[PDB]
Design a protein around this nucleic acid. Structure first.
Lengths: 95, 108, 97, 83, 180, 97, 79, 108, 96
DNA sequence: ATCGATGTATATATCTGACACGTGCCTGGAGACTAGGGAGTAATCCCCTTGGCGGTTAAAACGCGGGGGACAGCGCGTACGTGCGTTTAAGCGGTGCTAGAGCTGTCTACGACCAATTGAGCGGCCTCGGCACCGGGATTCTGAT
DNA sequence: ATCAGAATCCCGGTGCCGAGGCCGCTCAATTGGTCGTAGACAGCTCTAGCACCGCTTAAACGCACGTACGCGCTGTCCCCCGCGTTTTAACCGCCAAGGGGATTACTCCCTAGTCTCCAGGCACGTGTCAGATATATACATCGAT
């Protein structure tokens, strides 16, 4: 068997079946979605790395990711992404 | 005795907080990674995926093809204003372009 | 007989090729061009099929965006025809020269 | 083996098709050699970077990943071939 | 109403049940077409009476374009004897009339907007993406395409009584939705 | 009296301001503009002097490079006068609009 | 309205440094709008960098980092 | 314990190899840093510094100045072909521009 | 009293006196040279980090730095920078 | 005006490879416990940002003639678009094979870590010479003639 | 060509302040030793890329011909430039204050590290169904008719 190679396909699939509960998705669009998620991950984590190194911090907190989201994403997308992320962090710390 | 439990379920997420946390630690982004950072980041990735997939599903419904092809993602990204600003220096393969013709080329 | 005016079938081709998603350069001449260009940098290279497909998608996206900017240059000069100086102006304003 | 006269394999109808996707109503005759030179310059840049990535890996086949990294290195990020 | 809808397209399917070859049917007939990339089956057309022929190598026969149901039966019989005189054995069983298409005119325009607003679950109209209005009642499986002019075309029927009952069933709503 | 032809002292001024390195916007109006712009993002903000100076050097470098690209647009359209459509073409070809 | 404080002579000086011979009269309001958009982007990113550090003064390093995020790297104010 | 010969002297460099190694280890660039990597990187930094400072000293001598000011570094960078490609998206403060006037603006 | 902020000022000054023994340098030009060295350091180290992550290695070696220099710098500049780096690494390995 | 050839938006038919989904496995993610050090907080101090006064001068605002350049109209000729017959090579479908991608195992060189040493680099102080402003003469273009 | 005339450039003098050098200090690099681990090398597998060959057919190519568009020329008028006058507000300097940013010290809780364990996610098999694509019916358009 080939060595395990992780991918974001299953998650993007669950998000698609929540949002559009009857549509499918091609495998090429799947690879596009996987590379999109990886690219935005690299962008936000790189800006968080820069934010931790600028302020002489050694940890990446939710504040560094939140500020990196405000820097990377455009305006209304950034407000809604900050709202969804804060909602998820509160739901995580409450449980 | 908490035999079955995950972090994504606690944070009400589908995206893996464990994989995101492992990628943040193995990516050499910092010396340490806080506990809420992969939760917040997986939520942001989930929101951006939901926005692009929502607009691509609307494009697919408009084009009457159920499956999402690269053309529908390209139409969704280039037709949204703020997603085109996020992905302005990004080529989506097999995506084509927006059907835009300048007005001075259209005839009488 | 029948005859179209110069420029109507051109707009029909514009609508067709902006409606479609296929690769507009043919695959084997582009692959031969890629191998000759790679020959200078190093010898005995083997190219994965996906690599040449990625180079073709990237090259055609680059050329399509450059022709959009070239069309903006030509329309800016009160023209409809794109000249090579339109490509030179687009590539200098982009930051490539 | 040995390859030549291939930049003219990017034919005049292919350049006209790419201009039709670019929304170009009318094309000069001097466009095609300029476009072939531009495509040659772009391919030299991306292919030089892809070769460097290939060599650094001590490989001899240029993978799709190498091209994708060579385009991300130049700000021409390409989705759909890996990550 | 009272007027019989004129039948336009009678699409039926008959099984042949035999092993065939494509080159001999493509060469031993008249006015045929084979494009391998589009279909792996040979297409042909017969002028008297007009019906487009659709030949499969598995022993399948699809007739379209007949003017009436008896016209489709005699067209399938003609295609069967074509298959018999080229040299195979064709039969006349499992006559499936899956599509009956009829058209007529009510001679008066019908206000599409009223049927869209009163029957938003039953219909949907947008001026640039679909000028026809779709209607589907529940006792048959039927798709309707009422138009601005008042053109009414039915399809997907198995027997012409369905188009008759559906025309007399849609006649009240367009009768109270007249326009000049 | 005496009078120069229109464009000679302008070209000498071009040579003067391309020879010099000074800031061409005055400090205090630019600083007021920076603070007014900053006010909406967050109230009660201070600025280091070096911050305002850095913003001036970046803003003037951006505007000077945009005026070079605008000049290329105007020369491309067989003009010498720069129009606002030249600025719009320069900002569209760079990828800003 | 201090956006007008970016005066017509200042825009003429910037265009002379850009090598512009003749300047139309509608250039100045568009140039002021362009400069306001540029400063809005850069100042928004710099105030984001300032709020992240829990500071209330915008330092020059925040402006320099904001310029590198745009890809307009600036030398001479740290880095 | 013999006399502590500085690592920079060994490699024959003026740029600090030890400081570059400390910045590579504290910068979270990778989990580990090889021994020759700060030597190579300090050599490259010294070569690029020497190239720019040579061209800037030439520009300052051509302007008959003794000290190098930002204008001389800007002239050095923008007058070299490859340094303009390396610093194409870089603004040098107080550097001005190259004295370039287009040909259509020059008179008869 | 204040923090001993690290800076490449003395090394840029030593290289300037090595290549131009009478030419000096201003303070603003020194800050531009310091930020230039920091920027090129961050570029080469970032691409060396990328090269180590792409090949699934955990060590930045001199091969990663050499390839990152060959990627960042343009042609003749990159070949001379690779020559300087190889000469310095060989001189470092010949010594202890 | 007109008309017909060409795309287009809905009806059925079958066909197909890719997409959905079901399954086994296993290895990565989760529970639990630990230290320790990084981050949070509180007091302090000083420096550097904000704010004001004043003058004053150089720069911005304004008016106006005019000239030269934008722009509209026009003519032409030629280069490019359109269509058609020919040919050429791309695409596709098999065949074969072997370089090399990729994975596994081993082990040793090599890099993290740690303690002691110490000397390079940084902060601070001082000074002098490079540079900047001012005045004048000389040269350099500019423009009407 | 020539000459008056603004405008820039060279030379010299005065000043001044910032770059260069020196000295104390301190902390960060060096050296010496230890230990885990990672990647260099060998070797095996088996994938897929290359090289070739034959057939088909659609795209490329060469050419004829017409015409729309690029380009050059001309006139006009408008609106930007050059310059003189008035005004105004930036700049320099100087001072006061206070506030917030940097500093140091103490604490505590949050994350890496390690061990166990199991179940999500990945590779793989398979089945079936979205897309494709041919035929009536109906409708915008486009340009010769």
């Amino acid at each position: 068997r080939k060595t395990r190679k992780e991918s974001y396909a299953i998650y993007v699939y669950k998000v698609l079946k929540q949002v559009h509960p009857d549509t499918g998705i091609s495998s090429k669009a799947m690879s596009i979605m996987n590379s999109f998620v990886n690219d935005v991950f690299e962008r936000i984590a790189g800006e968080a790395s820069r934010l931790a190194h600028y302020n002489k911090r050694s940890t990446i907190t939710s504040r560094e990711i939140q500020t990196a989201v405000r820097l990377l994403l455009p305006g209304e997308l950034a407000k809604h992404a900050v709202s969804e992320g804060t909602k998820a962090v509160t739901k995580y710390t409450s449980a | 005795r908490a035999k079955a439990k995950t972090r994504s379920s606690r944070a009400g997420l589908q995206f893996p907080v464990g994989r995101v946390h492992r990628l943040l630690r193995k990516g050499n982004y910092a010396e340490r990674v806080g506990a809420g950072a992969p939760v917040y980041l997986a939520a942001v990735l989930e929101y951006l995926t939901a926005e692009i997939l929502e607009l691509a599903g609307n494009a697919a419904r408009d084009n009457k093809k159920t499956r999402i092809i690269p053309r529908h993602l390209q139409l969704a990204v280039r037709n949204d204003e703020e997603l085109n600003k996020l992905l302005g220096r990004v080529t989506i393969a097999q995506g084509g372009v927006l059907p835009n013709i300048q007005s001075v080329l259209l005839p009488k | 007989p029948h005859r179209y005016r110069p420029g109507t079938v051109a707009l029909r081709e514009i609508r067709r090729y902006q409606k479609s998603t296929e690769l507009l350069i043919r695959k084997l001449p582009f692959q031969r061009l890629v191998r000759e260009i790679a020959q200078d940098f190093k010898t005995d290279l083997r190219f994965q099929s996906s690599a040449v497909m990625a180079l073709q998608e990237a090259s055609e996206a680059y050329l399509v965006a450059l022709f959009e900017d070239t069309n903006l240059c030509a329309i800016h000069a009160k023209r409809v025809t794109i000249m090579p100086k339109d490509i030179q102006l687009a590539r200098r304003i982009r930051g490539e020269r | 083996k040995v390859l030549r006269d291939n930049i003219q394999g990017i034919t005049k109808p292919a350049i006209r098709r790419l201009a039709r996707r670019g929304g170009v109503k009318r094309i000069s005759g001097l466009i095609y050699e300029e476009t072939r030179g531009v495509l040659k310059v772009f391919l030299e840049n991306v292919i030089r970077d892809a070769v460097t990535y290939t060599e650094h890996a001590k490989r001899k086949t240029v993978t799709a990943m190498d091209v994708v990294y060579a385009l991300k290195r130049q700000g021409r990020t390409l989705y759909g071939f890996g990550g | 109403s009272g007027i019989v809808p004129t039948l336009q397209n009678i699409v039926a399917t008959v099984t042949l049940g035999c092993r065939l070859d494509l080159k001999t049917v493509a060469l031993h007939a008249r006015n045929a077409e084979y494009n391998p990339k589009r279909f792996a089956a040979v297409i042909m057309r017969i002028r008297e009476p007009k019906t487009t022929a659709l030949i499969f190598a598995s022993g399948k026969m699809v007739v379209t374009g007949a003017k009436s149901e008896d016209d489709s039966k005699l067209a399938s019989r003609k295609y069967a004897r074509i298959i018999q005189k080229i040299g195979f054995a064709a039969k006349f069983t499992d006559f499936k009339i899956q599509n009956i298409v009829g058209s007529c005119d009510v001679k008066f325009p019908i206000r599409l907007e009223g049927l869209a607003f009163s029957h938003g679950t039953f219909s949907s109209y947008e001026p640039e993406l679909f000028p026809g209005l779709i209607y589907r009642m529940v006792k048959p499986k039927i798709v309707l395409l009422i138009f601005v002019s008042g053109k009414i075309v039915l399809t997907g029927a198995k027997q012409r009584e369905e188009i008759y009952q559906a025309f007399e069933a849609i006649y009240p709503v367009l009768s109270e939705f007249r326009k000049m």
